[PDB]
């Protein structure tokens, strides 16, 4: 697909049987999802952004489907204002920036 | 050009006779640069991200050359962790996400 940037690049992603709306964010190293209960072990982590840092839960090897494309990787869960798909997952689906 | 995301998408920008490094960020509505002086009248604005909100100074109609392409628009200045080129200017240089 080719996605223009006139509006926020929100797409549908599938995780654990739940379909959510997420922002394709080239400005995020990691993928951060709104509070959700994922099974498996996790580790505490601090991630920073424009207004400071927030504490999140890091889960590994989580299957995620982004617009029909299948990916598997790390997912951080915490109090983020919006669901965010980062570069760790975007690279897996061959996503690039073009101009 | 085509930029992959295995590494942060940093590019050189030229603004006011100054060269700086910025990140092409599809997750930001606006363009925010670290503290610096710019010509013209500026007004206080507040923006938010993960971690909360910060105060910035808004400068309108500022010429910005991004990796060779010209844009003229709004540039915010403040305590951002990294210089970021947001969608307001990405659209001007015809940038899109592809996969």
């Amino acid at each position: 697909p080719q996605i223009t940037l006139w509006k926020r690049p929100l797409v549908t992603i599938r995780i654990g049987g739940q379909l959510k709306e997420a922002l394709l964010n080239t400005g995020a190293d990691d993928t951060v999802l709104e509070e959700m209960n994922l099974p498996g072990k996790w580790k505490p982590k601090m991630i920073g952004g424009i207004g400071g840092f927030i504490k999140v839960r890091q889960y590994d090897q989580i299957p995620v489907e982004i617009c029909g494309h299948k990916a598997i990787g790390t997912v951080l869960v915490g109090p983020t204002p919006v669901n965010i798909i980062g570069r760790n997952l975007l690279t897996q689906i061959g996503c690039t920036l073009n101009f | 050009p085509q930029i992959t995301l295995w590494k942060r998408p940093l590019v050189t920008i030229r603004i006011g006779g100054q060269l700086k490094e910025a990140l092409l960020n599809t997750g930001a509505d606006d363009t925010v640069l670290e503290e610096m002086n710019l010509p013209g009248k500026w007004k206080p604005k507040m923006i938010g991200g993960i971690g909360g909100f910060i105060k910035v100074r808004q400068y309108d109609q500022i010429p910005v050359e991004i990796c060779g392409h010209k844009a003229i628009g709004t540039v915010l200045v403040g305590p951002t962790p990294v210089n970021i080129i947001g969608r307001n200017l990405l659209t001007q240089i015809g940038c899109t996400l592809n996969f």
């Binding site: 980062g86 | 960020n25 991200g49």
Partner: peptide
Amino acid sequence: KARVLAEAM
């Protein structure tokens, strides 16, 4: 430390 730079006015 990783950065997640989502931003909105």
